[PDB]
Amino acid sequence: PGVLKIVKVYLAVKRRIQPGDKMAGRHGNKGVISKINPIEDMPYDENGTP
Amino acid sequence: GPEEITADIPNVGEAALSKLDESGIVYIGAEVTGGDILVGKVTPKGETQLTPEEKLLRAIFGEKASDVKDSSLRVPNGVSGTVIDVQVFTRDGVEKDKR
Amino acid sequence: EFLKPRLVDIEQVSSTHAKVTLEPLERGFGHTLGNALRRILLSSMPGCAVTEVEIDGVLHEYSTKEGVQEDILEILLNLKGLAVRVQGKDEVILTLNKSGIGPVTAADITHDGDVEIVKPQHVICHLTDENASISMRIKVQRGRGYVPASTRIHSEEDERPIGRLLVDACYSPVERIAYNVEAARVEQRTDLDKLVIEMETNGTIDPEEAIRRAATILAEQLEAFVDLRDVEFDPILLRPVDDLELTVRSANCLKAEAIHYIGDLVQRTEVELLKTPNLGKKSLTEIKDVLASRGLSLGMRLENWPPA
């Protein structure tokens, strides 16, 4: 009875991964990220893929 | 009295009203953040002791002269995003909104 | 007393893969040059990437278009991986208009003056309704490293129309770099090493040009080592006092106390300003009144005072 009009507004935001975020495998091993290393600083095999 | 949703919000400039249509609701897909206005809702105020200073105020500025307060929906601080959908609903008997 | 590597036997496995060979190298320079080159190639290589999109009937990334099978987010993700080359321009606009059935590929992009599509079998969307059409405008820029769409705020100087969709920018043509060191065929020398660098790109950058640019970057960075050596602001302040329109009796007393700027005046507390000669209690209110007329209350503390 009191209300004459209802307005509903939806917002969407894309959260990207960052150090504080929490990541875990499905074997109980969980952790928080610590650093976002550059591509060239990661270990690579003899084929050069990091 | 009754609360009206209008695009014209007293005391608020044109820049904040850039993302509001002629009906007072943000455009679909508008990217908002901080505290930008999403809907412009106006709350009326009671005034019945008509005083001459209010007469001068009413003469210089508009017929409302910003007598009615505004209580508009603003994005809560620290929230950002793009508007996806608006789901305005209206009561039976009341005139249909533009959107 | 040192041999200089020469780029010989550049061999092109495929339009993307490449091998670059440096024949003469000393005993240990192979690994040093290989790692420096690989880090430079993977870190910073100029490239071209899609920065923004604008489809006709789209409004935001989280919508759908009638007749297309992929969502707009999927279309943007497909466009992100598209690779181009442009000569002498950094702000190219590519128009894509296609109506019909089946996939829409990079091949049907309207042929610009000098915009090379490396892979024209790169599908980006599908059309399923017969009387359905897709029309879009894609902006391609030239950059150096990864730049998220969110970080760039300088583009917000001029307002953007509702519908200009921002995509992330990669800007890096090189995808994978590896290298190896083997024995050279130089028989007269005692023992020399040969370096081979295998590259996998998006087809944008010439391998020889990429190695040349990386070597240039390394030399430019090292050039700074070859010669070490090396062994009151807010405008209302700092103005003359002769703008507050004081009284005649206050003109001489302010000058008598060597107060010639507005800023130096606001630092004098009331308790000692009253001890000044022939100040006047009522005249002390006048200077406070005109000083408060600009928003400055008497008694602030600053940190320094330049002559200006």
Curated annotation (Swiss-Prot), chain A:
Membrane spanning stretches: none
Practical and industrial applications: Co-administration of salinamide and rifampicin or salinamide and myxopyronin suppresses the emergence of resistance to both antibiotics.
Known partners and oligomeric status: The RNAP catalytic core consists of 2 alpha, 1 beta, 1 beta' and 1 omega subunit. When a sigma factor is associated with the core the holoenzyme is formed, which can initiate transcription. The rRNA transcription and antitermination complex (rrnTAC) consists of RNAP, NusA, NusB, NusE (rpsJ), NusG, SubB, ribosomal protein S4, DNA and precursor rRNA; S4 is more flexible than other subunits. In pull-down experiments interacts with CedA. (Microbial infection) Interacts (via flap domain) with Escherichia phage lambda antitermination protein Q; this interaction renders bacterial RNAP resistant to transcription pausing and allows it to read through termination signals.
Source organism, top-level taxon: Bacteria
Known role: DNA-dependent RNA polymerase (RNAP) catalyzes the transcription of DNA into RNA using the four ribonucleoside triphosphates as substrates.
Assigned protein family: Belongs to the RNA polymerase beta chain family.
Chain's gene name: rpoB
Name recorded for this polypeptide: DNA-directed RNA polymerase subunit beta
Organism: Escherichia coli (strain K12)
Post-translational modification: Acetylated on several lysine residues in the presence of glucose.
UniProtKB/Swiss-Prot annotation, chain C:
PTM sites of type N6-acetyllysine: 281-282
Entry EC no(s): 2.7.7.6
UniProt effect for mutating residue 39 to C: In rpoA112; temperature-sensitive, blocks RNA polymerase assembly
Region feature Alpha C-terminal domain (alpha-CTD), mapped onto this chain: 233-308
Record-linked SMART domains: RPOLD
Organism domain of life: Bacteria
Keywords: Acetylation, ADP-ribosylation, DNA-directed RNA polymerase, Nucleotidyltransferase, Transcription, Transferase
Alpha N-terminal domain (alpha-NTD) as annotated region, ranges: 1-229
InterPro entries attached to this UniProt entry: DNA-dir_RNA_pol_insert, DNA-dir_RNA_pol_RpoA/D/Rpb3, DNA-dir_RpoA, RBP11-like, RNAP_asu_C, RNApol_insert_sf
Chain residue ranges for the region called Required for interaction with Crp at class II promoters: 156-159
Catalysis: reaction(s): RNA(n) + a ribonucleoside 5'-triphosphate = RNA(n+1) + diphosphate
The UniProt record lists the keyword Coiled coil: no
Entry comment on modification after translation: Acetylated on Lys-281 and Lys-282 in the presence of glucose. PatZ controls acetylation of Lys-282 but not of Lys-281. (Microbial infection) ADP-ribosylated on both alpha subunits by the phage T4 protein ModA. ADP-ribosylated on only one of the alpha subunits by the phage T4 protein Alt.
CDD domains named among the record's database cross-references: RNAP_alpha_NTD
GO CC terms: cytoplasm; cytosol; cytosolic DNA-directed RNA polymerase complex; membrane; transcription elongation factor complex
The family this protein is said to belong to: Belongs to the RNA polymerase alpha chain family.
Protein name, UniProt field: DNA-directed RNA polymerase subunit alpha
Organism: Escherichia coli (strain K12)
Gene of this entry: rpoA
